[PDB]
Amino acid sequence: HGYVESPASRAYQCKLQLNTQCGSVQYEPQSVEGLKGFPQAGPADGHIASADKSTFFELDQQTPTRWNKLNLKTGPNSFTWKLTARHSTTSWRYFITKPNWDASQPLTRASFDLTPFCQFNDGGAIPAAQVTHQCNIPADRSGSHVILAVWDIADTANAFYQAIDVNLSK
């Protein structure tokens, strides 16, 4: 429960009315929550970013023209989280689809590069209610693709991937 302010996830974009059909998330974007266990005890394919919840189903299913594909660059980027919870985190991770992935298809576990490119495993970091970090997006992941950002809670078995759809460049 919280959202990433920038890069603007499809959850936050729905409230900004840049995305539609969330129904719920377009009025409360910080509603997003999910469960640890990815990939073995994780959601079904096409429900991976949704954490197997219907209100986040549009947050996993995209067509390449359905959302604002934010025009951003590879290399250093900022990642500013806005948390409605004072409790501790145990990890932050970011991972992407392959550069030539099927972008009108549901997110399968096979469509990803399952290795996170910027995992920050801080085990017990009590947040300042906001968590601004910076990280470097890989350069060979340019073009139109999705980037999933996950925040793992320390206190609970919760973790949720907040996807942002982008048109990246190098």
TrEMBL record:
Primary localization class, coarse: secreted
GO molecular function, one term: monooxygenase activity
Entry coiled-coil feature ranges: none
Cellular location(s): Secreted
Statement: the UniProt record of this protein carries the keyword NAD: no
This protein's UniProt keywords: Monooxygenase, Oxidoreductase, Secreted, Signal
Keyword Signal appears in the UniProt entry: yes
InterPro entries in alphabetical order: Cellulose/chitin-bd_N, GlcNAc_Chitin_IntDeg, Ig_E-set
A Pfam family hit: LPMO_10
Chitin-binding type-4 domain boundaries: 1-166
Disulphide-bonded residues: 14-22, 118-135
Gene Ontology process terms (BP): chitin catabolic process
A Gene Ontology cellular-component term: extracellular region
Domain of life: Bacteria
Protein name: Chitin-binding protein
